[PDB]
Amino acid sequence: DSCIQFTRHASDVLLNLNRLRSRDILTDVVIVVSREQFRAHKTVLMACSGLFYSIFTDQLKCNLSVINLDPEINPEGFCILLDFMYTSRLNLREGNIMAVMATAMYLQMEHVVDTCRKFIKASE
Amino acid sequence: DSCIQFTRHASDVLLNLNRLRSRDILTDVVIVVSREQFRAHKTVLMACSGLFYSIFTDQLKCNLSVINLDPEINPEGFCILLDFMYTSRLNLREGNIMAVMATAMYLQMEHVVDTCRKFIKASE
Amino acid sequence: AWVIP
Amino acid sequence: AWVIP
Amino acid sequence: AWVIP
Amino acid sequence: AWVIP
């Protein structure tokens, strides 16, 4: 109502969360993707992905410190999506779009799937 | 470089973090302010406040599930600042500006202190 | 986009 | 920054 | 939404 | 605003 807003707040919060991840501060889960490990914060994963939201709201899976993804998942595809979760920037290229799209479908990140479909249709 | 950006990403992440707080999902700390308790996520507090960043990077304080603030701190002032951390909106009013400013000085949130000083100087 | 319930 | 939301 | 940063 | 080191 009588609220004022700090424009850069949400992006500053995101940048600071990424610095915590980068420095391994308060990370509480290891995501394993075909023998490669990625440290992260469960709250950030839940806040970006429908799959991680369903995993960490489960009464048993919420307690796990290690989550293994389907080994057919591309770790570069996962890494591109994890970087997007922590920064808002999606490094989408001709050489990775198919892997990024398949990973976003798996992670239930519809906005990413949508942009991938648009970039593919523009190329065809 | 070849990155695309989802404009609403950071604000969607923040809104989802606030929904997790509201539903008490993965909250990992209780902030006590003159016998009133506020549940939160340590990572969000660290990402917004210099004081919480110093507390939760300390090798002993990082393990505490309860943090007591100075009892002279105003809980409404704290609540306004916690709501700002989780939403980007600061409910700054004539009746609370002095308490909000003192709380922001204590929490080391310089951008909030700055806007308070500007609103006070405009009134004088 | 993803919005939590 | 500060703006009117 | 998607934009050029 | 606050930017973490």
Numbering used by the authors:
A (entry chain A), B (entry chain A): 6 to 129
C (entry chain B), D (entry chain C), E (entry chain C), F (entry chain B): 0 to 4
What sentences appear in the manuscript?
B-cell lymphoma 6 (BCL6) protein, a member of the Broad-Complex, Tramtrack and Bric-à-brac (BTB) / Pox virus and Zinc finger (POZ) family of transcription factors, plays a key role in the formation and maintenance of B-cell germinal centres. BCL6 has an N-terminal BTB domain, responsible for obligate homodimerisation; a long unstructured central region involved in interaction with the MTA3/NuRD complex; and six C-terminal C2H2-type Zinc-fingers involved in DNA binding. Disruption of the SMRT or BCOR corepressor interaction with the BCL6 BTB domain is sufficient to inhibit DLBCL cell growth.
The primary WVIP binding site (Site 1 in Fig. 4) overlaps with the corresponding residues in the BCOR and SMRT peptides, and its binding mode is like that of these longer peptides. The interaction of BCL6 with the WVIP peptide is mainly driven by polar interactions. Consistent with the low affinity observed in the FP assay (16% inhibition at 980 µM, n = 4), the WVIP peptide bound to site 1 could be easily displaced in soaking experiments with the HTS hits.
